[PDB]
Amino acid sequence: MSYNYVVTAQKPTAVNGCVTGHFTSAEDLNLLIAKNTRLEIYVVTAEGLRPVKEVGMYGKIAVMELFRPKGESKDLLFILTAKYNACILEYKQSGESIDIITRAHGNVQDRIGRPSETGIIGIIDPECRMIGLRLYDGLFKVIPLDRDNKELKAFNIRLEELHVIDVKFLYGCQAPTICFVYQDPQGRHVKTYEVSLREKEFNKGPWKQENVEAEASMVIAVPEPFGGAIIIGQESITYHNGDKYLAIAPPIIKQSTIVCHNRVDPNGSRYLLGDMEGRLFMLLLEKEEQMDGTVTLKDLRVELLGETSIAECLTYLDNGVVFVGSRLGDSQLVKLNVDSNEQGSYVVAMETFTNLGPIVDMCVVDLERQGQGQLVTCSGAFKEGSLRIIRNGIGIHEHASIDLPGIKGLWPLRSDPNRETDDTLVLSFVGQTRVLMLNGEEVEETELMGFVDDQQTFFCGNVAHQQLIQITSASVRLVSQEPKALVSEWKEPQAKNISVASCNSSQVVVAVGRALYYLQIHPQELRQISHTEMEHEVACLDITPLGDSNGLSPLCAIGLWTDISARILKLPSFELLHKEMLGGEIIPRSILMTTFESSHYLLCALGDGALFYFGLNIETGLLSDRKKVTLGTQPTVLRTFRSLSTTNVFACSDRPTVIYSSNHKLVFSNVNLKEVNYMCPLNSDGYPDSLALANNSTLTIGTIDEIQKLHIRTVPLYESPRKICYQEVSQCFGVLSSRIEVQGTTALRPSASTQALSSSVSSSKEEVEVHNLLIIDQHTFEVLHAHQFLQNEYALSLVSCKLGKDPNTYFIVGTAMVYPEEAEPKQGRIVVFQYSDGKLQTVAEKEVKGAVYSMVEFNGKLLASINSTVRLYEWTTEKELRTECNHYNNIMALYLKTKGDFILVGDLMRSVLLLAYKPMEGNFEEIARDFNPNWMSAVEILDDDNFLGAENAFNLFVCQKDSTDEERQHLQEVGLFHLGEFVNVFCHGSLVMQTPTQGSVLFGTVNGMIGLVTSLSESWYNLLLDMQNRLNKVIKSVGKIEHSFWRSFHTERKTEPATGFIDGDLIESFLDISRPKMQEVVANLQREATADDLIKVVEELTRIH
Ligand SMILES: Nc1cccc(-c2nc3ncccc3o2)c1
């Protein structure tokens, strides 16, 4: 009935978990990071983190632990998903190919069972005897680790303690033993049990229970030789080992709850601890010797090390390097020093990794140019709060601009053999060459002895033996560096024109029609080595040396006319090693051998904007795994360049692109420039690490931004942003923010709301939240003004609009007065503000008897939701809000969107409702509601007949009118899809410059994932649904989870297959399967579709984000 397509624009960035161990090999130290559905694998080096493999799971990662059974040469990986898919995984690398093998899998959900409120805990016995899971209160699930248990069959043990806080397996025990903290009416306690595989039951544990602190929250299992357990609370740290009990109460930890730990030393002598304010501590266990050679714990000390991002997880990585995994801010690599700095910190940040999450609100604005949307998010929380400005494509920073038309090629060179930097740029034109010298920033015409100016140059550069080369249509010219003189000249035997040229430091291959000549560069000598006659006219050549080659290529890559082939030839014989026919009647224009992330590729661009690429074996010359993308509609010219110590390929066309590698796959990112015809890298005194760019009329010099799909600007607020709106007439944003103060109440640090240029305060008629409206400049993101709300006043909703016949644009804020014992608020305000002359003036107020959860401008009026009421206000001539009409049939109306006279209302627990304003009756009519209960997080109107909801269990659904009257009032859920993210905000718009899809809705999530929803025809839906089913038969999923299971709508009330939703991430993955697989997919598929049809289809779909 409705057909929707959902695709990832930005993968989740929040770190949900981290572990270290030896997974990729026994001798590698690995960091594994869980980002919701993604697992990232790194090798830890001196240099830092090298990425080796990133995979997606068809599940949310809830447990991630490395372990090593006897007989295994390296660690295996246990994963449990939030839908209770369990697997054991093994890393396998066969040559260049890397695969995650599933050693065991099965689903471990029970039939009855309310998910424990305090979440899934999974733990692994140190001796790998069993995996233990706390999934539900009152039960402990055991998976025995026998070699025969490939289905991960489990049994449940009754657990008398219903409210477990945390649990670990202990070290040094003859039977598998758990230690856990639990809560009962008498307080919190620590207890142990042995786990008997024979009896499938608990036995008495080795040490008796103790009462612990009221807020004891984490258990640490300390390795031998200590053994035992550390229990971390809010004001105490205790150690237990039976006839051993030791407790400290250090004041230094009392300010903020400690929420994560990591073992620094294998023997447990030191642990890192992180708290909710980003403090990093070291916990030190002091040893005492004993006559019998055991070691017991003498004392415990805690030392403040410094400050990090607020850590969800910590991993020590050796040599003082710590990974800080953050959910609420950026993740980091930090270094711990033995000696402190000026301010007394041992912590120095080394590297920052972007986290957009949580995205709590966002808007789309054309900040810089018309038609180019940028997303501005409210990101992070507490000291990590920020605005983030997100935009597609890679920028260039122009540093020079010369009027100079007709350029046909650019080459840099070093005219001085004693200087490392380029000082010369050679330009070709039709039939001519010009040399430009660079003196700092000055760029000046000149001659260069040895080079000719009256022929077109096809290549020039530095070559071996301190020489320069120029290849023109007439000859190859070899020039000495000191002095500049012609030392050798090569011409074809009858002096026919050269038509194509390739060159490296010591080798030359030139074409003359169908003839090829191979030359070597020697001292004062161009030596002709060999020649051949190709079957067809030569279109393009490359001899870029790859790998451990010593600057020499044994291969020549060639593109031919007529048969449209890309071929690899051996030098010097010119023997054919491999031929690929590219199809069509349009010749290759650019061919390049290149390396990315240590793998070799052949790139071949046609004159129609097609780019083919292949794996290249530089030993055998074999091309494999052909792929194709379209980079424009014009001939593309390819050229290698380096930035940030990485070689990439710049593709010149009508749509300039950078080609690079990410997770050992080629990626393509737009450069934000108009048409570029030619380019070369340029690294001169005045223009270090730059690019020279030419179009039809202009030569530019500039630097390039980071090579990535999306560019992100961060604006730190040092406090929690809550909502955002743009006010075009003021050229600024309004942002609701809150900061924590401690009760007179005192602030913890300066932040946006206490550092505005000017400030104002409302006048009345982790201790406390103080709320503010910030006014922020759209260009500088400076905080121009901050208005502080009343004590106990929480700002919930924000809109920028005009009302009635009043020409002013206002910022309007809806609030709640929050008191401790109230089930919900019974008081709040709507406040209308005018931003004028650097400050917010209060124009009007309205007291209401509830929380103002949501507001929208509606046909020149103000729509607001207040507790269980939706209300429409008019703006009177006396500049006051006056109630027009009310709707009462809600539990708690949290979310509003409107289109025309229609209003979509999202409820706390009864899903969505459609209202209409009746302009000829001045009131609301309830049109229809979704009678299925759903706990809503966000809503959006897709169009007049289709309503999108997100709910708290990470599902999307789509409702439509069912086209009796009682019947017309029943909205139908026609689309269902498990997304696996928590949606905070939907907003209409696109990051692409303004096909199979209609409409564009972006969403922002808690994990900092950004998605897109668009609409499909029935026809397109049917084709893509068929593709999915076929893809699902050929793709091997990690952990052998079925895609259909993953995407099934799932709440406590209802599990059903997905319907009316295409998984764009799955569809896009078609462009990464093998050619056989594509054939399997494309067989007997409705017109009988071919692989190459689908490739093109999936490209039109990738361009929507
Ligand atoms: N050297 C290198 C290259 C590319 C990506 C990364 C990286 N991205 C991360 N995101 C979160 C946490 C840790 C991370 O490390 C690191």
Q: How far is the CA of 1065 from the centre of ligand 1 (A)?
A: 21
Q: How far is the CA of 33 from the centre of ligand 1 (A)?
A: 9
CA distance 319 to 321: 6
Contacts of 880-888 spanning 24+ positions with Cβ under 8 A: 880/844, 880/846, 881/830, 881/832, 881/844, 881/846, 884/922, 884/923, 885/917, 885/922, 885/923, 885/924, 886/924, 887/915, 887/924, 887/926
Written as one string, the DSSP assignment of 683-712 is -BSSSTTEEEEE-SSEEEEEEE---SSEEE
**Residue whose CA is at the smallest distance from ligand 1 atom 1:** 49
First-to-final CA distance of the chain: 25
**Residue whose CA is at the smallest distance from ligand 1 atom 14:** 353
Which tokens is 1012 given?
């897109």
CA distance 381 to 716: 11
Compute the half-sphere exposure of residue 918: CA atoms within 13 Å on the CB side of its CA.
Answer: 11
Q: How far is the CA of 398 from the centre of ligand 1 (A)?
A: 29
| Contact 51 CB / ligand 1 (< 6 Å) | yes
CA dihedral (622, 628, 629, 630) positive or negative: positive
Q: How far is the CA of 99 from the centre of ligand 1 (A)?
A: 20
Distance of CA 541 to the CA centre of its chain: 38
Contacts of 85-92 spanning 24+ positions with Cβ under 8 A: 85/58, 85/59, 85/1039, 85/1041, 85/1045, 86/131, 86/143, 86/152, 86/1039, 87/152, 87/1038, 87/1039, 87/1040, 87/1041, 88/152, 89/1038, 89/1039, 91/23, 91/24, 91/41, 91/53
Q: What is the DSSP letter of 422?
A: B
Which tokens is 1092 given?
């190459």
The answer to whether residues 179 and 160 touch, using CB atoms and an 8 Å cutoff, is: no
The answer to whether residues 59 and 1039 touch, using CB atoms and an 8 Å cutoff, is: yes
Neighbours of 231 (CB within 10 A): 24
Give the type of residue at 455.
Q
- Closest Cα to residue 775, out of 790, 759, 764? 759
The answer to whether residues 39 and 33 touch, using CB atoms and an 8 Å cutoff, is: yes
CA distance 616 to 247: 63
Resolution of the model in angstroms: 1.9
CA distance 1028 to 1063: 8
The answer to whether residues 242 and 293 touch, using CB atoms and an 8 Å cutoff, is: no
Residue of 32, 33, 645, 660 to mutate, ligand 1, most atoms within 8 A of C-beta: 33
Q: What is the DSSP letter of 1023?
A: H
Question: What dihedral do alpha carbons 669, 673, 676, 681 form, nearest 10°?
Answer: -70
160 Cβ partners below 8 Å, 6+ apart? none
Q: How far is the CA of 378 from the centre of ligand 1 (A)?
A: 23
Which atom of ligand 1 is nearest to 49's Cα?
1
Which tokens is 755 given?
């550092």
Decide the pairing of beta strands 258-263 and 245-248: unpaired
| Contact 33 CB / ligand 1 (< 6 Å) | yes
Experimental approach was X-ray
Q: How far is the CA of 42 from the centre of ligand 1 (A)?
A: 8
CA dihedral (982, 988, 994, 999) positive or negative: positive
- Is the previous residue joined to 206 through a cis bond, with omega within 30 degrees of 0? no
CA distance 798 to 855: 7
Residue of 41, 42, 47, 354 to mutate, ligand 1, most atoms within 8 A of C-beta: 42
- Closest Cα to residue 942, out of 1008, 1016, 869? 1016
The answer to whether residues 512 and 501 touch, using CB atoms and an 8 Å cutoff, is: no
CA dihedral (1071, 1075, 1081, 1086) positive or negative: positive
Q: What is the DSSP letter of 820?
A: T
Coil/strand/helix, residue 62: strand
| Contact 326 CB / ligand 1 (< 6 Å) | no
Residue in the structure block whose two tokens are 């008081």: 827
Written as one string, the DSSP assignment of 733-769 is EEEEEEEEEE---EESS--GGGS-SEEEE------EE
Neighbours of 658 (CB within 10 A): 20
- Closest Cα to residue 605, out of 664, 643, 557, 646? 557
**Residue whose CA is at the smallest distance from ligand 1 atom 13:** 353
Written as one string, the DSSP assignment of 216-236 is --EEEEPPTTT-SEEEE-SS-
Which DSSP helix (H) or strand (E) runs through 1079?
helix 1075-1082
**Residue whose CA is at the smallest distance from ligand 1 atom 16:** 49
CA distance 453 to 474: 12
Decide the pairing of beta strands 187-196 and 201-204: antiparallel
**Residue whose CA is at the smallest distance from ligand 1 atom 11:** 353
Which tokens is 195 given?
């786990």
The answer to whether residues 891 and 936 touch, using CB atoms and an 8 Å cutoff, is: no
CA distance 687 to 694: 16
| Contact 355 CB / ligand 1 (< 6 Å) | no
| Contact 178 CB / ligand 1 (< 6 Å) | no
Q: How far is the CA of 52 from the centre of ligand 1 (A)?
A: 11
**Residue whose CA is at the smallest distance from ligand 1 atom 3:** 51
63 Cβ partners below 8 Å, 6+ apart? 78, 79, 80, 120, 121, 122, 133
Residue in the structure block whose two tokens are 């027009």: 884
Decide the pairing of beta strands 1061-1063 and 4-10: parallel
- The strand pairing partners of 155, in sequence order, are 142
| Contact 11 CB / ligand 1 (< 6 Å) | no
CA distance 951 to 935: 5
Surface-to-core class of residue 843, CB atoms within 10 Å of its CB (0-12 exposed, 13-18 middle, 19+ buried): middle
| Contact 317 CB / ligand 1 (< 6 Å) | no
Coil/strand/helix, residue 1022: helix
| Contact 8 CB / ligand 1 (< 6 Å) | no
The answer to whether residues 757 and 785 touch, using CB atoms and an 8 Å cutoff, is: yes
641 Cβ partners below 8 Å, 6+ apart? 647, 648, 649, 650, 679, 680, 681, 691
What backbone torsions phi and psi does residue 1031 show, to the nearest 5 degrees?
Answer: -60, -40
Q: What b-and-e string marks burial along 909-931, b requiring 16 or more CB atoms within 10 Å of the CB?
A: ebbbbbbebeeeeeebeeebbbe
Angle between helices 1018-1034 and 1075-1082 (to 10 degrees): 130
Q: What is the DSSP letter of 497?
A: P
Question: What dihedral do alpha carbons 336, 338, 339, 344 form, nearest 10°?
Answer: 50
Residue of 19, 20, 30, 49 to mutate, ligand 1, most atoms within 8 A of C-beta: 49
The answer to whether residues 245 and 210 touch, using CB atoms and an 8 Å cutoff, is: yes
Which atom of ligand 1 is nearest to 33's Cα?
12
Cα–Cα distances in angstroms (integers) from residue 455 to residues 317, 458, 1023, in the given order: 59, 10, 55
Cα–Cα distances in angstroms (integers) from residue 428 to residues 404, 431, 452, 497, 827, in the given order: 11, 8, 11, 16, 75
Which tokens is 947 given?
């309503």
Q: How far is the CA of 137 from the centre of ligand 1 (A)?
A: 37
Cα–Cα distances in angstroms (integers) from residue 637 to residues 433, 588, 632, 877, 1099, in the given order: 19, 10, 11, 64, 21
CA distance 496 to 150: 71
| Contact 49 CB / ligand 1 (< 6 Å) | yes
**Residue whose CA is at the smallest distance from ligand 1 atom 7:** 353
Which tokens is 1002 given?
């972006």
CA distance 357 to 815: 24
Q: Which CATH architecture does the domain made up of 4-359 adopt?
A: 7 Propeller (2.130)
| Contact 309 CB / ligand 1 (< 6 Å) | no
Q: How far is the CA of 713 from the centre of ligand 1 (A)?
A: 18
Question: Hey, do 4-359 and 396-711 end up sharing a CATH topology, with the first three levels equal?
Answer: yes
Angle between helices 1075-1082 and 1091-1102 (to 10 degrees): 100
- Closest Cα to residue 1000, out of 4, 2, 1? 4
What backbone torsions phi and psi does residue 147 show, to the nearest 5 degrees?
Answer: -70, -25
What backbone torsions phi and psi does residue 1026 show, to the nearest 5 degrees?
Answer: -65, -45
Q: How far is the CA of 352 from the centre of ligand 1 (A)?
A: 9
69 Cβ partners below 8 Å, 6+ apart? 76, 128, 145
| Contact 912 CB / ligand 1 (< 6 Å) | no
Q: How far is the CA of 331 from the centre of ligand 1 (A)?
A: 9
CA distance 936 to 930: 12
**Residue whose CA is at the smallest distance from ligand 1 atom 5:** 51
The answer to whether residues 711 and 721 touch, using CB atoms and an 8 Å cutoff, is: no
Give the type of residue at 274.
G
The answer to whether residues 207 and 179 touch, using CB atoms and an 8 Å cutoff, is: no
713 Cβ partners below 8 Å, 6+ apart? 388, 389, 781
Which tokens is 644 given?
């940030």
Q: How far is the CA of 887 from the centre of ligand 1 (A)?
A: 50
| Contact 331 CB / ligand 1 (< 6 Å) | yes
Which residues precede chain breaks (C–N over 2.5 Å) in the chain? 743, 765, 963, 994, 1086
What backbone torsions phi and psi does residue 1066 show, to the nearest 5 degrees?
Answer: -65, -50
Which DSSP helix (H) or strand (E) runs through 189?
strand 187-196
The answer to whether residues 569 and 533 touch, using CB atoms and an 8 Å cutoff, is: no
Neighbours of 686 (CB within 10 A): 17
| Contact 229 CB / ligand 1 (< 6 Å) | no
792 Cβ partners below 8 Å, 6+ apart? 768, 817, 818, 819
Which tokens is 814 given?
């809806």
Written as one string, the DSSP assignment of 664-689 is TEEEEEEBSSS---EEEEE-BSSSTT
Written as one string, the DSSP assignment of 859-904 is TTEEEEEETTEEEEEEE-TTS-EEEEEEE---S-EEEEEEETTEEE
CA distance 259 to 101: 33
Question: What dihedral do alpha carbons 49, 50, 55, 61 form, nearest 10°?
Answer: -10
Residue of 31, 40, 662, 1007 to mutate, ligand 1, most atoms within 8 A of C-beta: 40
Neighbours of 481 (CB within 10 A): 17
Tell me the Ramachandran region of residue 859: left when phi exceeds 0, alpha when psi lies from -120 to 50, beta otherwise. left
CA dihedral (705, 708, 713, 717) positive or negative: negative
The answer to whether residues 850 and 827 touch, using CB atoms and an 8 Å cutoff, is: yes
Residue of 321, 353, 646, 664 to mutate, ligand 1, most atoms within 8 A of C-beta: 353
Question: What dihedral do alpha carbons 564, 565, 566, 567 form, nearest 10°?
Answer: -150
| Contact 333 CB / ligand 1 (< 6 Å) | no
Which atom of ligand 1 is nearest to 325's Cα?
12
Q: Dmax over Cα atoms in the chain, in whole Å?
A: 103
Residue in the structure block whose two tokens are 């396998």: 92
Cα–Cα distances in angstroms (integers) from residue 872 to residues 293, 858, 886, 915, 993, in the given order: 79, 8, 7, 12, 36
Which DSSP helix (H) or strand (E) runs through 1028?
helix 1018-1034
The answer to whether residues 904 and 917 touch, using CB atoms and an 8 Å cutoff, is: no
Q: How far is the CA of 14 from the centre of ligand 1 (A)?
A: 12
Rg, C-alpha atoms of the chain:
33
Surface-to-core class of residue 76, CB atoms within 10 Å of its CB (0-12 exposed, 13-18 middle, 19+ buried): buried
CA distance 448 to 196: 87
The answer to whether residues 169 and 228 touch, using CB atoms and an 8 Å cutoff, is: no
Contacts of 26-31 spanning 24+ positions with Cβ under 8 A: 26/73, 26/74, 29/317, 29/318, 31/315, 31/317, 31/323
Alpha helices in 235-285 (DSSP H): none
Q: How far is the CA of 353 from the centre of ligand 1 (A)?
A: 6
Which tokens is 623 given?
């091309």
| Contact 353 CB / ligand 1 (< 6 Å) | yes
Q: How far is the CA of 1098 from the centre of ligand 1 (A)?
A: 28
Cα–Cα distances in angstroms (integers) from residue 286 to residues 226, 489, 960, in the given order: 10, 78, 66
Surface-to-core class of residue 189, CB atoms within 10 Å of its CB (0-12 exposed, 13-18 middle, 19+ buried): middle
Tell me the Ramachandran region of residue 838: left when phi exceeds 0, alpha when psi lies from -120 to 50, beta otherwise. left
Question: What dihedral do alpha carbons 207, 211, 212, 215 form, nearest 10°?
Answer: 130
The answer to whether residues 84 and 108 touch, using CB atoms and an 8 Å cutoff, is: yes
Q: How far is the CA of 356 from the centre of ligand 1 (A)?
A: 14
CATH 3.30.1130.10 fits domain 396-711: no
Q: How far is the CA of 43 from the centre of ligand 1 (A)?
A: 11
Q: How far is the CA of 303 from the centre of ligand 1 (A)?
A: 29
**Residue whose CA is at the smallest distance from ligand 1 atom 8:** 353
| Contact 726 CB / ligand 1 (< 6 Å) | no
The answer to whether residues 246 and 194 touch, using CB atoms and an 8 Å cutoff, is: no
The answer to whether residues 467 and 480 touch, using CB atoms and an 8 Å cutoff, is: yes
| Contact 352 CB / ligand 1 (< 6 Å) | no
Q: How far is the CA of 51 from the centre of ligand 1 (A)?
A: 7
CA distance 490 to 512: 13
CA distance 719 to 770: 10
Compute the half-sphere exposure of residue 139: CA atoms within 13 Å on the CB side of its CA.
Answer: 18
**Residue whose CA is at the smallest distance from ligand 1 atom 10:** 353
**Residue whose CA is at the smallest distance from ligand 1 atom 9:** 353
